[PDB]
UniProtKB/Swiss-Prot annotation, chains A, B:
Organism (species): Alcaligenes xylosoxydans xylosoxydans
Subcellular location: Periplasm
Job description of the protein: Cytochrome c' is the most widely occurring bacterial c-type cytochrome. Cytochromes c' are high-spin proteins and the heme has no sixth ligand. Their exact function is not known.
GO biological process: electron transport chain
Protein name per the record: Cytochrome c'
Length: 125, 125
């Protein structure tokens, strides 16, 4: 699916846009601004779970481009910990949503958001 | 998530790009050009299933834009049948992949592809 590096960039940017839309739309619920519908949030977090695993395979060898910093590949072990932190946080978010626990969902959501920002600050231009 | 029509366009384009990548990468397997790994295809078709439901909510009222033709909204019943045909075909593809049946997977894949093209020819500029 990624014949040229531009194809990997296009795919990962699309995946990250979708992941961001499914994460960000839950902000009002975790802030108490909109009612918590546990079944709807559980379904949305399943979509996010699915999406959250997709970008990383499109940052393979020779896929420099987009707004991705070169240190993703020169500091691969460190990038892998930023990715793992995020994926571990998605597991926590799923656990909270599957249990229908709003207080745990809020904590997990803030952990996910902090991991998005940590990777942005180190590896996104 | 779609405050302005441009946000709905961005989301749906991202979803359609991902859906296309997960569909298209199975072409060599259904053509007999690459070995069929039933468990890998089952996992990929689950991703595609997930993705295939996402664009349509981003073609709501007042979301004209992108390469979407206006007849999506002026002929809504007809667009809904092109969308349903495609989603019905994704159910067939999932059934084949879950059963590990390559011959059924090939048929279902060609049905999905024909439904992509049918909607493209009528509703994509
Ligand atoms: C590193 C491990 C990351 C984590 C975790 C998250 N993002 Fe990120 N993001 C990262 C990179 C290296 C890039 C640039 C990709 C490129 O090749 O250009 C991005 C990009 C985005 C984007 C823009 C996508 C686009 O349409 O171009 C968005 C909206 C984005 N990232 C959001 C986002 C959110 C909401 C995250 C947590 C849920 C998140 N990212 C995690 C690196 C990493
Ligand atoms: C109507 C019911 C559609 C079906 C079924 C499929 N697609 Fe489509 N697609 C459709 C429209 C109206 C548009 C334009 C969206 C816009 O606002 O611009 C598209 C677009 C695409 C794209 C381009 C996405 C982008 O990055 O801009 C691709 C790659 C695409 N469609 C592929 C595709 C495939 C592979 C499909 C079947 C698996 C498929 N589409 C179905 C309408 C419809």
């Amino acid at each position: 699916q990624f014949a040229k590096p531009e194809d990997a960039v296009k795919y990962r940017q699309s995946a990250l846009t979708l992941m961001a839309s499914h994460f960000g739309r839950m902000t009002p619920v975790v802030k108490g601004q909109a009612p918590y519908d546990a079944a709807q949030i559980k379904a949305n977090v399943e979509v996010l779970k699915t999406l959250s695993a997709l970008p990383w395979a499109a940052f393979g060898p020779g896929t420099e481009g987009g707004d991705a910093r070169p240190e993703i590949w020169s500091d691969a072990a460190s990038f892998k910990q930023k990715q793992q932190a995020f994926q571990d946080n998605i597991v926590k978010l799923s656990a909270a949503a599957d249990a229908g626990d709003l207080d745990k969902l809020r904590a997990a959501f803030g952990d996910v958001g902090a991991s998005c920002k940590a990777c942005h600050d180190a590896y996104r231009k």
